[PDB]
């Protein structure tokens, strides 16, 4: 259960763009500065930049 500090604009066809305050079900946070988050609103998957999200 993380929160996108800011709306992230997907940079490639592997990450999902989120908004500020949007909840993101983190998945794998060991690949590096990019973790796989799953949006529950639509139900899609997409990596995400950790600098735009925060552990609440």
């Amino acid at each position: 259960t993380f929160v996108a500090l800011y709306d992230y604009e997907s940079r490639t066809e592997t990450d999902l763009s989120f908004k500020k305050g949007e909840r993101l079900q983190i998945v794998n946070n060991t690949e590096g500065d990019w973790w796989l988050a799953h949006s529950l609103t639509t139900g899609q998957t997409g990596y995400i930049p950790s600098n735009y999200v925060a552990p609440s």
Binding site: L5, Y6, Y8, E9, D33, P49, S50, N51, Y52
Partner: peptide, 6 residues
């Protein structure tokens, strides 16, 4: 390279 934070 993460993006530029707001």
């Amino acid at each position: 390279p993460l993006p530029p934070l707001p």
